[PDB]
Design a protein around this ligand. Sequence first.
Ligand SMILES: N[C@H](CCC(=O)N[C@@H](CS)C(=O)O)C(=O)O
Ligand SMILES: N[C@H](CCC(=O)N[C@@H](CS)C(=O)O)C(=O)O
Ligand SMILES: N[C@H](CCC(=O)N[C@@H](CS)C(=O)O)C(=O)O
Lengths: 443, 437
Amino acid sequence: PLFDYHRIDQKLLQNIVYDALVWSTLNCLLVGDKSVQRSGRVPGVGLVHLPLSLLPGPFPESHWKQGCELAPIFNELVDRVSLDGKFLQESLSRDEFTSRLLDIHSKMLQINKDIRMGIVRSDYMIDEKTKSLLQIEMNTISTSFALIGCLMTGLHKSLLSQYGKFLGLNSNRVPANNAVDQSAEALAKAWSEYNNPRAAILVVVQVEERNMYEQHYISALLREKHHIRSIRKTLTEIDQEGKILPDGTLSVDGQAISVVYFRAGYTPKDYPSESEWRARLLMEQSSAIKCPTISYHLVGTKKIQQELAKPGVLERFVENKDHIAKLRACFAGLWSLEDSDIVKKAIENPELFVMKPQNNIYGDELRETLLKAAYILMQRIFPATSPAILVRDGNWDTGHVISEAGIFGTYLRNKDKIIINNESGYMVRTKISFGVVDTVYLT
Amino acid sequence: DYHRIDQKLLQNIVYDALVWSTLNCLLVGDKSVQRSGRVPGVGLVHLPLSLLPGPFPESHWKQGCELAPIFNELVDRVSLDGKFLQESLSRADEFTSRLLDIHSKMLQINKKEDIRMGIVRSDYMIDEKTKSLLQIEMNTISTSFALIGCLMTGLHKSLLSQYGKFLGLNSNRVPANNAVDQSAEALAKAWSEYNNPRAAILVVVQVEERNMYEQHYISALLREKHHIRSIRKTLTEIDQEGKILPDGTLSVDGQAISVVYFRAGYTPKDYPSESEWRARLLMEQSSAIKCPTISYHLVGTKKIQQELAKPGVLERFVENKDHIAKLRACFAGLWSLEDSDIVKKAIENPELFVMKPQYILMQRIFPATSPAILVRDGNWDTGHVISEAGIFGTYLRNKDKIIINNESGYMVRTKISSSYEGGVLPGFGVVDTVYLT
Ligand SMILES: N[C@H](CCC(=O)N[C@@H](CS)C(=O)O)C(=O)O
Ligand SMILES: N[C@H](CCC(=O)N[C@@H](CS)C(=O)O)C(=O)O
Ligand SMILES: N[C@H](CCC(=O)N[C@@H](CS)C(=O)O)C(=O)O
């Protein structure tokens, strides 16, 4: 144990936790309590610290470097796949939700309708077999925790400033984070690119938003730092409110909308009725720059990401061989009816493989294979468990947790000028065995 | 006249204020949540606030600001007169005289406090005839709301940047407020005069503190800005955990303490037993800088606060006759060691004065009213309210060297009551700022 944090004497942790709880209040590491009924609609009431790991867990410096250089590679890959409507339409037209999303994509295709931007997130985990950094998810739409992840960097750096050498650790190895500034800056640059100085930013939000303070903070940054107004509306409000003018400008609550920032619309529970599908359509048709576009949203679906990971598919959207190499190194293997992996690599050694739907099947039952629900074959990831202190509604407890590190990218282009393509900070979600937020403690 | 504002627009401002409050830690423990005054980060709620500032003449603002060093210097002087204080408060309620006790014990060992400081607050009203700024109270000890006041300034400037247009108001006109930074600064310079690099600041704190964030924020400036450490402890923790070192240094929980910052101990309720009275005496006898000493507590009590106000008393502690004019001007008529101005000019016109048949005697305070929006537990309502302006002062000196004597930001306290929907506490009222002129 190098810091198996469970060892730390229970007297010194009453104090660290105490300080951790102070800092979170002072710095708005706060969310609506689930237990309080209005805390997702009324700000300023029913507030509570984000559930949190007290001290950061370890992540090799090299694999953190690796994730950092992937960030702009994934950005350009997401833009490239999104430009292929036939790949997208072929792949996915095989789920009422997805099929509704594809409609909207078709409609645009049908109508030949660029300033393109993204604020996206690639989630990784370290795998104990290969010792590799592996991509777990690419989030192309409405990525949370740009603020949270970067208050956490601050929290843990504070804690370590106070308690470090008393524990063997230096804040230095909690990496610097700018996720939320990069985010608001990507937005401000897009608004600039549209070059309507009268335009506001639309931020599409959920009816119930306990995490509303992350959003207000980005809006505060936009307003005070970038001098740009933003307005927050639910999809059903955009259906009642929103109009397109005869020249294709979006007008929501009496103002031009140059940028549409989604922090909603990624779940089917966001579209209770036809009003919300109208609104998504209305907005997509408009000349507003969408953060992100419907094509981007589709790239991010489970189905597209699986298809990307199959042998030879990825390499269709990437010409750079160094990048090709980098991508494939973080991609967990995934396959269909290949006799070679999928009869027999997996039959002998059912150890990795898991079969998943396009129940999971593992281990001895994965001799499903000996007989040819779970439609594709992929490589098993074995995660790093580590001892943690978990602070929740003011109370701590110990557990052994796994961590998922997500790297933000921002991207902005106007037909062939790349204005932004960036690694833009991180967050970490740490969970038992929906968990807590965290950081990493490099190598 | 904010009651005259379209109700759905009002709801937009309140929504923005709630949001700003949350982002910028204008938060306390919710009274409704029982752990919230002990456990940080749980059960938070925004401060009750006035949505938007009442008007305040600018001339009277400047008047209240000029007066802060002058009250800073007067508190200190009265405090130096142990015999006066002793004359005026032997009379009695048990708490006041348990403070005299401790005062006598210090005069007795002829105790020396070479470095003296204050973080104090003069609370004022504009009275709606004569149009004069009048002192309501002089708070010498444990003055709350330096963070909260200067947050309220941020709030109202931000709302006015958004809405002031429509409204006809410029954010400009809400006075700039640095209360919390000047608070930490005074404590920083104090630690620095004392000159023990390894010493911490002790903040003396109530068992239950829903306003703890104000205190932690001050400790964060101390720690991050000034690189000074602090610990918090209740009076009974000090009794259990502290002691005087052979050279006189205070040591609490094995830490040397150079500065004792009172955020508790101004109410009998802070002394349930003889533990906390020990703790109070122990720190007084030590050589730690008290913020404030026992003499300053005394200068701010009801009985003394009245005594200076009566005619003549005030000349004994002030030399500058301007400063005597400034003080008399915000001094409201104050009387009775025997006066024929009692019940005379007072049973006959009792709508001015206060306090005889019909704890002594003042000119009556007729406050300006303004329509206001009040926000409490995420809910707003309209209300007609009165405001009380608190001007902070910071003072520090080392023998004859005045290191700091200074006006240091403000708070405003605004409440409905008497002619409308309430009940007497203030229901601590709400937090406010002012709009000049
Ligand atoms: N309710 C929004 C929705 C955003 C969201 O669901 N984000 C997912 C991204 S799809 C995440 O874990 O990033 C929030 O928490 O800010
Ligand atoms: N709990 C104390 C309360 C101290 C206090 O109530 N101060 C009052 C009266 S001395 C004030 O209005 O300043 C704090 O916040 O530090
Ligand atoms: N409003 C602040 C001033 C802070 C202060 O003391 N303000 C009074 C002078 S006391 C004022 O007239 O603003 C400013 O505008 O700079």
